[PDB]
């Protein structure tokens, strides 16, 4: 197996700035679903964020919309979340996970079809 | 007539009527009951107007629980006496207790024994259950009872990894949080599974063999059955399920290792501990089972009713479901054998006003099949010649409710948009939605995670009737009956499945009460029949195909990703079978051009291309078939040999790629890896080529 | 409801004592009968119990061989059979019975109450 | 046009001219020389009209022997000297000298070592004849290279006896009583054997599988190939053929028991004894064998022309023969290639003028065949999924001439009547007989055991082409060429047979000077496939079928009836297989009555009914296959796995009664018999109700 | 394996008469073709004279016919071969052979067809 | 047709002289050129054969590491390498051709003769 290497996050106020990364190693030459996953403190997972990397389209949350940015790494098989105006309900633990695809037809939003997985963290205070 | 005539001549009170009729008395398979029910619809079907109507018997290995020592479960002290046993039979329903042909609870196909030891809890019994208790848990499963819950499984895998673990014996359970929906009450004030309900099934491996001393070959008068040593799928260890009320009265006393995860878990007032024996005072207890059931040879019989085509009397449209329950099963399939019957009708009633279909039309009250599909499968094989070369569809028909949200549809993508189109020309039948196409309900409801706008149609996977006619003669499948909320519900299926309390009054009062949903499910199936069986050409679509073939491609390129330096090192390359399936989607997409503008008038060219699209699924699959499941052909859709619920596409490379991690060549493992794409990518190609253009 | 409890005995020890307590005027198709050992100046401790679907447990574990639990419909009763009474066994005895066919030992679920047989040990 | 523009099209001179460039220089397979002589096929394929010509390509598994290393056997001392030498080369034929393709004689797939020891006798290497070494005669076969004779039994099959007997080497001669017709000349002399004539062939066990490392899947670009460890039908053992000069100068020097019988002699002026070793005061030498041949991967070129069919463009009529050849092969298969090739340009000739046929034909110049049937099984195996549901026969074309007495037809009992009603338009070419039909001489020369008047018309066994499009697919084939007498020599096949000697100038003056006879084989083939390709109705006959069937029937229960006593002890019935060919007898029947009056006009009926024709065979095959031989599927004609050569219908009973007194346990091999009759009565009851009344 | 008891022939002068008798045991309840061959001191085998119990037929040579006719006795599975105005070109010997039969279509009249043989001998002196 | 022989010495033993004779105007493709030892008052006797397609075999098998056959067509010339030389073998060596590759030993069969170098032994 091989393991996606995160980071990212952390302890900052509301309204600040922030950034998420996800790093799928062996991944440099294949296109790939790079999406982002929250859960909730006692709350189950969401969609938050998510790339294409067969077609280069990009789909947010519609709260998430207007908010959320990926940022591409210059390595292809690593890419960044920058956060800004966090509002206190990002306060939970999201999570990045890759799909390997090669036509990469449709982006996918359930955690079902994801299979690598990783543990990301980052705490909002008011 | 037309279309029209057909779908509103399907009433709901005759299925209601017709459900009423099937549940008063126990039609188990191979008992004189269920003979005469047999011949009952046998007789109506051929008043009905059916052109020939035939009552194909077979002497198959089936399996009952003796009259005279009844079997049963119970705890059993140091000196021998017993403590605790388990209820010699179900509480009868109310309204139904002077009916004596009710059998006890029991699980098909057990062997006899008398088993005792202690009990370890092993959660839903899965692999990963296993597991856990061996790797992290450190329990040595071998030589003890087990007892396992329901779900997520069927009872055939279950039962098998047991038998991998070492267990003597299998104790089969429901629970309630599993089985119990919040809020509902039990029967018969509730449809949710009272104390006393047990649910029931067959503890089969059968790998679409069907007939266990017969495989491959129909159980003739002259047949040679082969011996109970070389049977197929037959478990080695006894199996008989219980409720959850006398399961608390044994899961309490046990103690132990604590659960180690919060799935680890139920509704019910135990530890749940998963630690092997009954901790403090009562130590010296155990369980001990009490299965005396016998396995003899008894004649089934499937009522096959042809209507002759018109047009191509050779190509046979089959639809089909199962008649025999172990209790009145008045969901199932009895729910699904009164809509087969009122097609069945309806059908007969438009053959009397002098309507013809296109395609013979081949409807079927199989037997048996709560034994595995023995009888499906026993009359496949006896008639494999003329299907396998005159087939066209086998539309299944069983349990066509199970909940009253939305319709569920699992079918190849080869009728996908017919699925589709069908849907939209019907009305929702659900809350809301009054005068809204069920198109549009399903939609809302149960979107296609891809477009919005599209609904999800899941696979055929594997299970009833349609088993033998897609995964072995590669003949298009489809399936469709009402569910529930499956994303805010947690009970896989219904409470009441497989039990006594499966009466006619559940499914009137705490299920459809109007048999409205019922309607809705007989008219979506019997529309699909119709369809495929009065259509100038075969109502299928190559490309939605070609398109999804993509996808799953993907899903097995993305778990070999998994590894991704292995890929590296064994120069393992999925670039064949992508070629293939680009290869498919272009060929698929100039069939799909000729097929828009080649003429229609010569019935020639006509019959060319709907065998060229009817053999496209007879494309897929290889003589040869799957490794050890010689009777697995399908390369796409089997089922594999692990994580058979889960239903991956690509058997062959899942399997292959199943626990490749722990190997001990790996060199040998990704070769046979290779392998298997090399083989996935040939079929593709082969497919294609078949849809090429010929000569 | 009637219950009626039978099988008043005076045995010193080692008795083979029939106790029989019968439905007469249950009106619910499902029954879970059990037995109480009311002890002088004790709580009543539930004995043993059968449900109507034959599934029966015995509480007093420690008698397990002192105590066996059985039931017929035919004549509609439900029977404890003793051997090798012991001196202690001195109580008074009540069939107990309710609809829900859980077997459990809890004496206020337990509405119904027979009038009750001393069984005398010396 | 019609069938006579077609026959009086072929001309004898244009076979003579093809004949003639076919053979002036090597065509081996998997060489630039056979890839050039493709090239030119194609080319010439071209202009002559055909629809489309094609040239696949598979990298499949060959041998050849080395060039700088030539194999050879030496007669070994004890003291390591070498005394005599096996001829490293066939003596050149007359006005071939400067040819230097000519590669020397060798066995195919024969692996490579140095093998030293005794040699032993083993008469023609037959079952029976091992059978007679080690239970009379004695002898420790194992461990020690023997020396057989050519014919009776395929090369295969002696190698494996060989391998079964422990042997070390093989090596392989052919006695002059066995290839030398008294009174005759030989080469350049006359046309029997010359002392350095060798001849060559495959030792390979592939069973139908074809490619050694592509077992049921093509050998294509992106194919995974197997290790040579699980290599199928690879012999163990080193084997090398001979001539009968350096054999005689062999096995002279042998001493020991004497030949048991008359059969174990030939006309060599030797002892023949069976006795190892080489006795008298020369006891210390021995046989070494020298083979550094080398199996590599080629690629090898099959030239398909497809000639689209006018009416029904899927029904493919497949009419091929292989052109690879040990050396130049003026009478196999550049004969047979050259009547093909004519064949070829006569249908042409016909497209040009405009003429279309009803039916879809391919012509395949296959490659490999020498090889092992490699070539054909891999272009099947590729295309099996278009010719399972399109293919309607094979009419096989190899060595049209081997002797001038009559023409030898070998075709399944569908074809049988055409067989009879095309030579009955045919003009004899035999001695004799001007004006006669060939119909007329056939009989009068090769009468039917049944009828005097009806010709006799073998089965169609095994070998060549028609393997598998036969024994797999189950597509009626069909083979002829003109044959010898028979009845009145020894010979099995003409002296010069797989030799370097196999020249032109062999053919056109000691076997056919005016090459009238290929012209009549020519006629005859290509009459089969015109009637094949250009009938309305499909020129089978299921009565005939249905009639010989009986006769096997009572052939395969008078062998059984051989142990009467065991056939009442373990209660083993034929009524089962006499009650089924019954069946078929009067279901035949009927389908024959109602196609004699079915209306032609109709095409959807007419298209039905030539695909129940068409299924008719595909019916007998069986997925499930043979035991241990999967890709033989055929239960009626398919080759046994003991006497191959004999031919003896049911295959699957008659291995199961193949020596079924020398058994462990009688019970368990009964019921097998028992099995297998169960098998092939459910067979012929499927055939039977496949021409039954559909719907 | 189950032995063909064959007996008569012996010794007999030209222009008498003699009789064949060959049982086939366990043929009892079956049809067969009971076939009758000479070979001859530096011949080979040739057909003499042969029956078809399941259409009850018999069948001979040119030169055999009104020479030889084929006989029977009252058990199914044995059958005669009565012999009359031998002359002393058949001084050569004959085999017995069977080839059990359900339909039994045609006789066979090639020594290859059948299965179970004899052993026979005759000496016709003149 | 010249069958001309060369190699004639008088090695006293164990001697390499080597005999060599070649075909001249050959006029048939096959051959089967051999040796004769023609012992002083004795018949001669077939020493080693070999035919046109390197099918050979020494007759003296006695002789078996003591004379080598072979032959090259580039000069179309036959070759036969004697070692360990003996007095006995003293003798005139005969070459023999004929167009049948058979590899005969016997003397009448073979009419085409050379010179017979001879080849002394002391
Ligand atoms: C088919 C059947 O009933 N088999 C046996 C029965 O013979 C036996 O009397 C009984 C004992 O309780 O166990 C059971
Ligand atoms: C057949 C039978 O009576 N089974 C059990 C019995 O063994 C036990 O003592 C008691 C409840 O555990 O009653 C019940
Ligand atoms: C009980 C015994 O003899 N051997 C067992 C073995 O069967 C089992 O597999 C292992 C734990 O996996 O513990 C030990
Ligand atoms: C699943 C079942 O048994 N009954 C359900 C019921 O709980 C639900 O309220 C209703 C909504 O339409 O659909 C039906
Ligand atoms: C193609 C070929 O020659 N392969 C081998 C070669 O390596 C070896 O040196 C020679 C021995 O004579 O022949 C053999
Ligand atoms: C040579 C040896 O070690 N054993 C052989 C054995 O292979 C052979 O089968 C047997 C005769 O059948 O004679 C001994
Ligand atoms: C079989 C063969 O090679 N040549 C034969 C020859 O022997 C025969 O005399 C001649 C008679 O037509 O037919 C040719
Ligand atoms: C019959 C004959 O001469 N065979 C020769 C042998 O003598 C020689 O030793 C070998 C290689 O040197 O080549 C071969
Ligand atoms: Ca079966
Ligand atoms: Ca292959
Ligand atoms: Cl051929
Ligand atoms: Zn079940
Ligand atoms: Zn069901
Ligand atoms: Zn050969
Ligand atoms: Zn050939």
């Not at chain 2, 042909?101 to 959660?123: H, K, W």
């Not at chain 3, 029977?79 to 066919?101: F, V, W």
Request: charged share 20%; hydrophobic share 35%.
């Amino acid at each position: 197996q091989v393991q996606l290497q995160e980071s990212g996050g952390g302890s900052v106020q509301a309204g600040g700035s922030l950034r998420l990364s996800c790093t799928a190693p062996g991944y440099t030459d294949s296109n790939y679903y790079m999406s982002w996953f929250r859960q909730a403190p006692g709350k189950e997972r969401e969609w938050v964020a998510g790339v294409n990397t067969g077609r280069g389209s990009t789909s947010y949350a519609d709260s998430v919309k207007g908010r959320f940015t990926i940022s591409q790494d210059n390595a292809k098989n690593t890419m960044f979340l920058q956060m800004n105006s966090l509002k206190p309900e990002d306060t939970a633990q999201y999570y990045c996970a890759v799909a390997a695809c090669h036509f990469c037809d449709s982006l996918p939003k359930t955690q079902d079809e994801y299979i690598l997985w990783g543990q990301g963290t980052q705490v909002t205070v008011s | 007539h037309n279309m029209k005539a057909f779908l509103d001549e399907l009433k709901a009170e005759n299925i209601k009527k017709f459900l009423y009729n099937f549940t008063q008395i126990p039609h188990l398979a191979g008992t004189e009951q269920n003979f005469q029910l047999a011949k009952q619809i046998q007789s109506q079907w051929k008043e009905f107007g059916l052109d020939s109507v035939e009552l194909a018997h077979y002497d198959v290995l089936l399996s009952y629980p003796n009259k005279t020592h009844p079997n049963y479960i119970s705890i059993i002290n140091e000196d021998g006496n017993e403590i605790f046993n388990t209820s010699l039979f179900e509480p009868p329903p109310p309204g139904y207790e002077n009916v004596s042909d009710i059998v006890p609870p029991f699980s098909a196909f057990s062997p006899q024994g008398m088993p005792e030891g202690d009990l370890v809890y092993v959660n839903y019994a899965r692999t990963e259950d296993f597991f856990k208790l061996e790797r992290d848990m450190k329990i040595n499963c071998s030589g003890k009872i087990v007892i396992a819950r329901y779900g997520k499984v069927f009872r055939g895998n279950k039962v098998k990894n047991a038998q991998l673990a070492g267990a003597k014996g299998v104790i089969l359970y429901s629970d309630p949080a599993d089985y119990f929906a919040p809020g509902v009450k039990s029967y018969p004030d509730g449809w949710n599974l009272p104390g006393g309900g047990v649910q029931r099934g067959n503890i089969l491996n059968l790998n679409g063999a069907g007939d266990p001393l017969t495989p491959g070959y129909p159980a003739n008068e002259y047949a040679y059955r082969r011996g109970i040593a070389e049977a197929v799928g037959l478990p080695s260890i006894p199996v008989h399920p219980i409720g959850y009320y006398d399961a608390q009265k044994l899961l309490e006393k046990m103690g132990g290792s604590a659960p180690p995860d919060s799935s680890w878990r139920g509704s019910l007032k135990v530890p749940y501990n998963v630690g092997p024996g009954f901790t403090g005072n009562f130590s010296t207890q155990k369980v001990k089972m009490h299965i005396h059931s016998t396995n003899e040879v008894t004649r089934i019989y499937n009522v096959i009713g042809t209507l002759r085509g018109a047009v191509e009397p050779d190509r046979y449209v089959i639809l089909g479901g199962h008649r025999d329950s172990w209790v009145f099963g008045g969901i199932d399939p009895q729910s699904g054998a009164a809509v087969v019957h009122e097609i069945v009708r309806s059908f007969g009633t438009l053959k009397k006003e002098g309507w013809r279909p296109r395609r013979t039309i081949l409807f079927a009250s199989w037997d048996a099949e709560e034994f595995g599909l023995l009888g499906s499968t026993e009359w496949a094989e006896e008639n494999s010649r003329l299907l396998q070369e005159r087939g066209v569809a086998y539309i299944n028909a069983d349990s066509s409710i199970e909940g009253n949200y939305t319709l569920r549809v699992d079918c190849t993508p080869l009728m996908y948009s017919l699925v589709h189109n069908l849907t939209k020309e019907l009305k929702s039948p659900d809350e809301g939605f009054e005068g809204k196409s069920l198109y549009e309900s399903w939609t809302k409801k149960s979107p296609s995670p891809e477009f919005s706008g599209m609904p999800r149609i899941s696979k055929l996977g594997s299970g009833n009737d349609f088993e033998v006619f897609f995964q072995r003669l590669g003949i298009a499948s489809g399936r469709a009956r009402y569910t529930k909320n499956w994303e805010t519900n947690k009970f896989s299926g219904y409470p009441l499945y497989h039990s006594v309390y499966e009466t006619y009054e559940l499914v009137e009062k705490f299920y459809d009460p109007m048999f409205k949903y019922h309607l809705t499910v007989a008219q979506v199936r019997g529309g699909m029949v119709f369809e495929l069986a009065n259509s100038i050409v075969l109502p299928f679509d190559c490309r939605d195909y070609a398109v999804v073939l993509r996808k799953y491609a993907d899903k097995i390129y993305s778990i070999s990703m998994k590894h991704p330096q292995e890929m590296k090192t064994y120069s393992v390359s999925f670039d064949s079978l992508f070629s293939a399936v680009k290869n498919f989607t272009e060929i698929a997409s100039k069939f799909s051009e000729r097929l828009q503008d080649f003429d229609k008038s010569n019935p020639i060219v006509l019959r060319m291309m709907n065998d060229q699209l009817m053999f496209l699924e007879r494309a897929f699959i290889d003589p040869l078939g799957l490794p050890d499941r010689p009777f697995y052909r399908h390369v796409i859709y089997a089922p594999s040999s692990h994580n058979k619920y889960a239903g991956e596409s690509f058997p062959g490379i899942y399997d292959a790629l199943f626990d490749i991690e722990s190997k001990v060549d790996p060199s040998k493992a990704w070769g046979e890896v290779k392998r298997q794409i090399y083989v996935a990518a040939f079929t593709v190609q082969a497919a294609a080529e078949t849809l090429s253009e010929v000569a | 409801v009637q219950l009626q409890e039978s099988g008043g005995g005076s045995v010193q020890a080692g008795g083979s004592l029939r106790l029989s307590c019968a439905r007469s005027g249950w009106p619910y198709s499902t029954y879970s009968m059990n037995w109480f050992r009311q002890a002088p100046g004790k709580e009543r401790e539930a004995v043993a119990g059968i449900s109507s679907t034959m599934s029966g447990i015995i509480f007093a574990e420690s008698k397990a061989g002192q105590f066996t639990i059985s039931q017929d419909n035919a004549k509609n009763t439900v029977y404890l059979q003793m051997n090798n009474l012991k001196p202690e066994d001195t109580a008074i005895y009540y069939c107990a019975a309710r609809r829900d066919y859980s077997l459990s030992s809890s004496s206020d679920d337990f509405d119904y109450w027979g009038q009750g047989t001393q069984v005398t040990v010396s």
